C-alpha cells in the first residue's frame, strides 16, 4: 500500500522538530564547561547531558499529541525516557571508525576512555557502545530515526504515568507510520521494524544500568555539586 | 606595646589559610563555563562565585576556633557571610585603573558592563564598585585583609546562630589582634581600624541588596537552572 496524508503529516512534523532541536554544527558545545582529558570529564559531560535534556524536551513539546497530555504525564514520560532519548539521539554523531562520538571538532570527540572519567563504568559503557554500533548499522532514515525517538518517549509502560490509555494510543499511531514507512520507503527493511523494537528493549537495560550508577554518584555531594539543576531534577527521584 | 605570641600565631595561621585558598595565577578560571560578552555572563560568574564559595569554606575551616563550633553554627555563619567574604576577597584582584576585576588574563577581566549581564542591576553594582574602591584605597596589609575576612565570618549577629556567646568571643579575639597589629605594624593606621569596621557595615547593605536580587533571579527556573548546586544551597533559604 502507501502511507496516507495523516501518516505523512506526522513524519514531516517529527522531522521538523528534530532539525529544530539538533544542531549539526554543535556550536553550542563551546559554551559547556571545558573537557579535561578523578572525574575530570564530569563537568563537561554533565553540561552536555543537561543541554541534551533541554533539546529532548523541546522535541517532545513538538510531538503531535504529547502537548495535550497532562503536565503530570509529560513529566512522567520525560523523567523516565529522557536518558533513552539521549542515547538514541547521540547516535547521530557516533562514528564506527574511531568508535566514538565525534561532535564539533577534536575537543568534542569523546572516546570510550573520555567517557570513563565521568563517573560511569564499563558495566554501562560496554553495552552502550555495543548499542550505538548495532544501531549505527541499521543505517536508519532520518524519518525512521525520528519516529523511533517519538515511540520511545511515548511508551505508556513507564512509572508515574496516569492516562495509560491515551498515550498507548499515540504510540500505536506512531508505531504504524514506522511499519508503513519502512514497508513502503525502505528497501530491504523487511526485518527493520522488528530490529528497531529490539533496540527499544535494549534501551531499558541501559536505562536501568545508568540509573543505578547515577544514584551512586548522585549520593556523593562532592560529585552531585558538579551536576546541573536540570540534570538533578530530571534524573532525581522526586515524585 | 607589641603583639604577643598568641596574637601572632593567629596572624600566621590566617595568612597561611588565605594563601592556600586564593590562587594568584587564577589558573582554575579556564575550567569555568566560558564568559560571553540576556544574562550571557550568568554561567561564567555563577561558576566563579560557586568556586569562590568553596574557597571561603576552606578558609573558614582553617580559622582557629571555627572548626570547634557546631556544624550548625558553621553553616549559619557561612550561609549569611559567604557573600560578604567573596566581596572582600575579590578586592585582591580589583583594579582602580580600569575600574574592574582583572584576574587571569583578558578573558577574566570583568568590567562593570560584563557584571551587568549576570542578572544584577546598578542598584547593587554601583555600591559594590563604590565599596571595592574605598576599600582598595585603604591599602591594607595581607595580615589586616585576612583578619578582616575572619572578623566578618565570625560575626555572631547573623540569623540562625545558636552559640551567640562563644562566637562573640572569637570575633573579639580577632578584632584585638587587628587593633594591635595596626597600632604596632601599620604606620598611619591611627584611623584604620575604625575605617575597616565601617567596611564591615557596608557589607551588610550589599549583602542585603544582593539577597533581594538573588531571590528574584532564583525564582525564575530558566535562570536558576544556570546556577550551581552549591550556589543554590548556600544562597538558598533552607533552614
Amino acid at each position: 500500500h502507501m502511507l496516507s496524508d495523516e501518516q505523512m503529516q506526522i513524519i514531516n512534523s517529527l522531522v521538523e522538530a528534530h532539525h529544530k532541536t539538533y544542531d549539526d554544527s554543535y556550536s553550542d558545545f563551546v559554551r559547556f564547561r571545558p573537557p579535561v582529558r578523578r572525574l575530570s570529564m564530569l563537568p563537561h559531560l554533565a553540561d552536555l547531558v543537561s543541554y541534551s535534556i533541554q533539546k529532548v524536551i523541546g522535541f517532545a513539546k513538538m510531538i503531535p499529541g504529547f502537548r495535550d497530555l497532562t503536565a503530570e504525564d509529560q513529566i512522567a514520560l520525560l523523567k523516565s525516557s529522557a536518558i533513552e532519548i539521549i542515547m538514541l539521539r547521540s547516535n547521530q554523531s557516533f562514528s564506527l571508525e574511531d568508535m566514538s562520538w565525534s561532535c564539533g571538532g577534536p575537543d568534542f570527540k569523546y572516546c570510550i576512555n573520555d567517557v570513563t572519567k565521568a563517573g560511569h563504568t564499563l558495566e554501562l559503557l560496554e553495552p552502550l557502545v555495543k548499542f550505538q554500533v548495532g544501531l549505527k548499522k541499521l543505517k536508519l532514515h532520518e524519518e525512521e530515526h525520528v519516529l523511533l525517538m517519538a515511540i520511545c518517549l511515548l511508551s505508556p509502560d513507564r512509572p508515574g504515568v496516569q492516562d495509560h490509555v491515551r498515550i498507548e494510543a499515540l504510540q500505536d499511531r506512531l508505531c504504524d507510520v514506522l511499519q508503513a514507512y519502512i514497508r513502503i520507503q525502505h528497501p530491504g527493511g523487511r526485518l527493520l521494524y522488528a530490529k528497531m523494537i529490539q533496540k527499544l528493549a535494549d534501551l531499558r537495560s541501559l536505562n536501568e544500568e545508568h540509573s543505578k550508577q547515577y544514584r551512586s554518584l548522585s549520593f556523593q555531594p562532592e560529585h552531585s555539586m558538579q551536576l546541573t539543576p536540570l540534570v538533578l531534577e530530571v534524573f532525581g527521584s522526586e515524585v | 606595646h607589641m603583639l604577643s605570641d598568641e596574637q601572632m600565631q593567629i596572624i600566621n595561621s590566617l595568612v597561611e589559610a588565605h594563601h592556600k585558598t586564593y590562587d594568584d595565577s587564577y589558573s582554575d578560571f579556564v575550567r569555568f563555563r566560558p564568559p560571553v560578552r540576556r544574562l550571557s555572563m550568568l554561567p561564567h560568574l555563577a561558576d566563579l562565585v560557586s568556586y569562590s564559595i568553596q574557597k571561603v569554606i576552606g578558609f573558614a575551616k582553617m580559622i582557629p576556633g571555627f572548626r570547634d563550633l557546631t556544624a550548625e553554627d558553621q553553616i549559619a555563619l557561612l550561609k549569611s557571610s559567604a557573600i560578604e567574604i567573596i566581596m572582600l576577597r575579590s578586592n585582591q584582584s580589583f583594579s582602580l585603573e580600569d575600574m574592574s576585576w582583572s584576574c587571569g588574563g583578558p578573558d577574566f577581566k570583568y568590567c562593570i558592563n560584563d557584571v551587568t549581564k549576570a542578572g544584577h542591576t546598578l542598584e547593587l553594582l554601583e555600591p559594590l564598585v563604590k565599596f571595592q574602591v574605598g576599600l582598595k584605597k585603604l591599602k591594607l596589609h595581607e595580615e589586616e585583609h585576612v583578619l578582616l575576612m575572619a572578623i566578618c565570618l565570625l560575626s555572631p549577629d547573623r540569623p540562625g546562630v545558636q552559640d551567640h556567646v562563644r562566637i562573640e568571643a572569637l570575633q573579639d579575639r580577632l578584632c584585638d589582634v587587628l587593633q594591635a597589629y595596626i597600632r604596632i605594624q601599620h604606620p598611619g593606621g591611627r584611623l584604620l581600624y575604625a575605617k575597616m569596621i565601617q567596611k564591615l557595615a557596608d557589607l551588610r547593605s550589599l549583602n542585603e541588596e544582593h539577597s533581594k536580587q538573588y531571590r528574584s533571579l532564583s525564582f525564575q527556573p530558566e535562570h536558576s537552572m544556570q546556577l550551581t548546586p552549591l550556589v543554590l544551597e548556600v544562597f538558598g533559604s533552607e533552614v
Binding site: 524536551i57 523541546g58 509529560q74 531534577e233 | 530558566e222 536558576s224
Partner: peptide
Amino acid sequence: RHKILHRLLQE
C-alpha cells in the same frame, strides 16, 4: 515539584 521541567514544558 519539578520547577524547571514545568517552566520548560510550557511556553
